[PDB]
C-alpha cells in the first residue's frame, strides 16, 4: 500500500548516495543504472505527498481510490494529477513482480 511506498522512498533517501545501489561507494559516476539521470528523483520523491494525503482505508485498499477520492488527494498534495497516476501504475507493476518472485 502507499504507507509502504513512502517507507521505500524514505529508506532510499536514508541509505542512498548517487542512487545506490549503482556503485555509490566509489562514487564515480556513480549511478548504478549508469545513467543516471537520477534516475529518481525530484518528483518520484514527491510520491510521498500523494500517499500522505490518502486515508488509512484508501492505503489498505487502493482499488477504492476513484475520481472523487483522487480529486481530493491531488488538492491536498498540491498535485494534479498525472504525477500521482504515474506513481500508482509503477506500484502496480511492483506488486506483480513481488508476487511472481518473492
Amino acid at each position: 500500500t502507499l504507507d509502504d511506498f513512502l517507507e521505500q522512498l524514505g529508506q532510499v533517501r536514508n541509505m542512498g548516495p548517487l542512487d545506490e545501489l549503482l556503485q555509490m561507494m566509489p562514487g564515480a559516476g556513480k549511478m548504478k543504472g549508469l545513467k543516471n539521470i537520477q534516475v529518481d528523483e525530484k518528483q518520484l520523491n514527491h510520491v510521498e505527498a500523494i500517499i500522505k494525503s490518502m486515508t488509512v482505508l484508501e492505503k489498505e485498499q487502493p482499488d477504492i481510490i476513484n475520481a472523487s477520492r483522487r480529486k481530493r488527494i491531488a488538492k491536498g498534495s498540491g498535485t494534479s494529477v498525472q504525477e500521482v497516476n504515474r506513481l500508482l501504475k509503477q506500484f502496480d507493476e511492483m506488486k506483480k513482480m513481488m508476487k511472481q518472485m518473492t
Binding site: 521505500q8 532510499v12 543504472g33 509503477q90
Partner: peptide, 22 residues
C-alpha cells in the same frame, strides 16, 4: 531472510522513483 526482504523492498522503491514503462 528478513534482511533480504528489506533489500528487495528498497530496490522496488528505487525502481518506482525512477519510473519505468509497464
Amino acid at each position: 531472510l528478513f534482511l533480504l526482504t528489506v533489500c528487495t523492498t528498497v530496490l522496488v522503491s528505487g525502481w518506482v522513483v525512477l519510473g519505468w514503462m509497464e
